C-alpha cells in the first residue's frame, strides 16, 4: 500500500494468561509484530515477489468535530 | 547476590570474618598484656608474657592472618622495649 | 564509474582528436572538430590561467577514460614517487591495464578495451584479471581466453594496430594474440602535444 | 658514581632540616630565550651545619618526611 520495504521479527501471541514469543506465523493466523517503522491499518504486508493489495480498507467518516488548544 | 557463586562467597566470607576476627582478638590481648607489663615495671612477668605471646603470632603469620613482617615488628619492638626497661 | 554519453562532444570541446572512435572514417567528416558543442560553440571565448590548466586536465581525463577520484589518486601517487611528477603521472596512466591493452592492439578504442577486460577476456601471466585499473609491471605478458580468441572484434582491431604507430615499450605477437610489457615508457614516448606541468599547476593550487 | 645536585640553602630555621634552591638555565620552548628556573627542596640536615646562602651538595634518598626526600652530602662554602 505505502510501497515501502520493512523487516519482521519479535512476533508475539496472546494466550489469555501470558504473551509468548513466536518465531513464525502461518496462513490463517493472527499475530502481532513489534518495531514496524511505518505500517497502518489496511496495509498489505506481503512477500516481496508479489505486491498485492487486498480490498484496501473502509473507514467511517467523522461525525463530531471540536477544537483542542493545550492551555 | 544474583549469582550462586556470589551467594556461596557471601556465607564463606561471613564464616571467614568471624573465624579470623576470633584469632585477631585473642592475639591482640597478649600484646596488650605485654604493653601493660611495660609500665607495670615487672621483670620476670614481662619476659613471661613475651615468651607466651611470641609463639601465638607465629601461627597467625604462617596462616597469613597477619604478615610475617608485621609479627616481626611486634616482637622486635616489644623485645626492644623490654630490654630498655629490664 | 563510466561515461555513457557522446564520444565526439568530448573531442569537440578541446578541438582535437581524442581517439575515442575506432577511426573507420575521418573525424572532420564525422563531426566538426573546430566547433565546440552547443549553440554557442561557434564563438571562441578567452581561457584564463585556471581555464587552460582545467582544460588540459579535463582533456587528459577523456584520453585515458578515468574519473576524478582515481585521477587525483594518480596525481598524489606520482607526487609521492621520486623524480618528475609530470611524467610520473603519465607513466601510471600508461600502466593502467586497459590502456596497454589498447596500445598493443587488442582494441581500437579504450572503451572496447575495458569491455573486453571486464569479461575475464584478459589474463596476465596466466592469472585472469577483470580490473581495468590493473597496474602492469615490466616483463608481464597478456593474452586472451580461448573463448574470446574467436572474437572478430579483436581481429579487426589487429589490423588497426599496425596502421597506428607501434609503441616501443610493448612487444606483441598477433600469432597467438599475446603481448609483453617491456618497461614503463619515459616522457618522450608519448606525444608532446599533452602538456604535463599544467596538471601539477592545477593540483598544487 | 652517585648522582649529584648542588644548590643554595635559603631556610635553615627548621630543626634538623634545610631548604635548598636549585637553579638551572633552560631554553624557552617557544621563543628560545634562556631563562633560569628555580626548584626548592627540603633537605635533611642533621647537626644543623648550614646557614643562609651557603652552597650545598644534596643527594636523593628515602622519603624521610612529608616533604623531605634529600640529604646533605657536603657544604662547599660558608658564611657568605
Amino acid at each position: 500500500v505505502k510501497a515501502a520495504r520493512e523487516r519482521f521479527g519479535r512476533i508475539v501471541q496472546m494466550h489469555a494468561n501470558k504473551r509468548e514469543e513466536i518465531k513464525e506465523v502461518r496462513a490463517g493466523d493472527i499475530a502481532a509484530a513489534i518495531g514496524l517503522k511505518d505500517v497502518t491499518t489496511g496495509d498489505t504486508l506481503c512477500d516481496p515477489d508479489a505486491p498485492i493489495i487486498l480490498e484496501r480498507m473502509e473507514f467511517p467518516e467523522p461525525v463530531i468535530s471540536i477544537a483542542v488548544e493545550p492551555k | 547476590a544474583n549469582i550462586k557463586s556470589a551467594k556461596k562467597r557471601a556465607i564463606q566470607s561471613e564464616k571467614a570474618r568471624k573465624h579470623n576476627a576470633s584469632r585477631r582478638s585473642m592475639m591482640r590481648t597478649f600484646i596488650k598484656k605485654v604493653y601493660a607489663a611495660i609500665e607495670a615495671g615487672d621483670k620476670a612477668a614481662a619476659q613471661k608474657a613475651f615468651n607466651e605471646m611470641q609463639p601465638i603470632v607465629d601461627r597467625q603469620a604462617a596462616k597469613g592472618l597477619i604478615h610475617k613482617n608485621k609479627a616481626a615488628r611486634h616482637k622486635a619492638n616489644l623485645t626492644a622495649q623490654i630490654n630498655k626497661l629490664a | 564509474a563510466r561515461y555513457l554519453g557522446p564520444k565526439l562532444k568530448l573531442s569537440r570541446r578541446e578541438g582535437t582528436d581524442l581517439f575515442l572512435k575506432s577511426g573507420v572514417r575521418a573525424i572532420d567528416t564525422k563531426c566538426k572538430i573546430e566547433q565546440a558543442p552547443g549553440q554557442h560553440g561557434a564563438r571562441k571565448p578567452r581561457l584564463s590561467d585556471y581555464g587552460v590548466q582545467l582544460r588540459e586536465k579535463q582533456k587528459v581525463r577523456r584520453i585515458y577514460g578515468v574519473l576524478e577520484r582515481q585521477f587525483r589518486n594518480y596525481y598524489k601517487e606520482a607526487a609521492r614517487l621520486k623524480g618528475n611528477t609530470g611524467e610520473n603521472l603519465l607513466a601510471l596512466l600508461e600502466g593502467r591495464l586497459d590502456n596497454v591493452v589498447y596500445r598493443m592492439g587488442f582494441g581500437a578504442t579504450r572503451a572496447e578495451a575495458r569491455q573486453l577486460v571486464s569479461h575475464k577476456a584478459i589474463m596476465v601471466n596466466g592469472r585472469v584479471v577483470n580490473i581495468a585499473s590493473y597496474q602492469v609491471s615490466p616483463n608481464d605478458v597478456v593474452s586472451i581466453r580461448e573463448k574470446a580468441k574467436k572474437q572478430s572484434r579483436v581481429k579487426a582491431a589487429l589490423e588497426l594496430a599496425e596502421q597506428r604507430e607501434k609503441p616501443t615499450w610493448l612487444e606483441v605477437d598477433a600469432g597467438k594474440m599475446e603481448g609483453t610489457f617491456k618497461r614503463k615508457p619515459e616522457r618522450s614516448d608519448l606525444s608532446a602535444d599533452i602538456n604535463e606541468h599544467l596538471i601539477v599547476e592545477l593540483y598544487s593550487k | 658514581k652517585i648522582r649529584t645536585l648542588q644548590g643554595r640553602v635559603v631556610s635553615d630555621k627548621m630543626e634538623k632540616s634545610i631548604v635548598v634552591a636549585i637553579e638551572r638555565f633552560v631554553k624557552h620552548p617557544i621563543y628560545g630565550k634562556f631563562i633560569k628556573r628555580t626548584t626548592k627542596l627540603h633537605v635533611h640536615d642533621e647537626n644543623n651545619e648550614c646557614g643562609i646562602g651557603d652552597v650545598v651538595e644534596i643527594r636523593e634518598c628515602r622519603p624521610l618526611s612529608k616533604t623531605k626526600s634529600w640529604t646533605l652530602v657536603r657544604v662547599v662554602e660558608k658564611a657568605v
Binding site: 496472546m14 494466550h15 489469555a16 494468561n17 502461518r26 490463517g28 493472527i30 | - | - | -
Partner: protein, 56 residues
C-alpha cells in the same frame, strides 16, 4: 517448521453485541473453559483480554 495444527482447525471469531450485552464476560468465560480443559489434562492466574487472543 511443519504446521502443528491443520489450517481447517483454526477458528477466527469475534464477539460483537450492544453495550452491556455481556461480551467481555463471554470472552473471559471462553478463555477460562479452554484453560481448565487444557489444565485438567495434566492436573487431576491473572487474565486480561485486551486485543485478540488464542485458545484451544
Amino acid at each position: 517448521s511443519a504446521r502443528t495444527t491443520p489450517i481447517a482447525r483454526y477458528r477466527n471469531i469475534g464477539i460483537s453485541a450492544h453495550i452491556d450485552a455481556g461480551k467481555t464476560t463471554t470472552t473471559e468465560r471462553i478463555l477460562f473453559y479452554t484453560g481448565v480443559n487444557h489444565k485438567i489434562g495434566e492436573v487431576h492466574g491473572i487474565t486480561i483480554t485486551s486485543a485478540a487472543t488464542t485458545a484451544f
